[PDB]
């Protein structure tokens, strides 16, 4: 029954329509988030130092 309802949900997702969007694979979500957090902090502190000077 689980595989049956899974295939049924696959069909229901196939019949659905949605405006297009774009992204990449799901394995690199947390890594990219951490890199973006680090880059944001670095850019913020650099901009703060430059502004103080």
């Amino acid at each position: 029954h689980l595989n049956f309802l899974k295939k049924r949900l696959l069909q229901q997702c196939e019949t659905l329509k949605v405006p297009p969007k774009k992204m990449e694979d799901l394995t690199n979500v947390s890594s990219l988030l951490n890199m973006e957090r680090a880059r944001d902090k670095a850019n913020e502190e650099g901009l703060a130092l430059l502004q103080e000077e």
């Binding site: 901009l47 430059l50 502004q51 000077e53």
Partner: protein, 52 residues
């Protein structure tokens, strides 16, 4: 964008300092010049009238 602003402000300060330097030198030399001139004039007139 902010890097260039920092660079140009540093350039402005480096260009502006020596004018202040030279103005200060001219001022504090002209002051003592005038003072010495006045003192010399006073002493010369005093001695002139004294001998007269």
């Amino acid at each position: 964008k902010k890097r260039q602003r920092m660079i140009e402000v540093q350039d402005e300060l480096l260009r502006l300092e020596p004018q202040l330097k030279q103005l200060q030198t001219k001022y504090d030399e002209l002051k003592e010049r005038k003072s010495s001139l006045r003192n010399a004039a006073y002493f010369l007139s005093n001695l002139k009238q004294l001998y007269q």
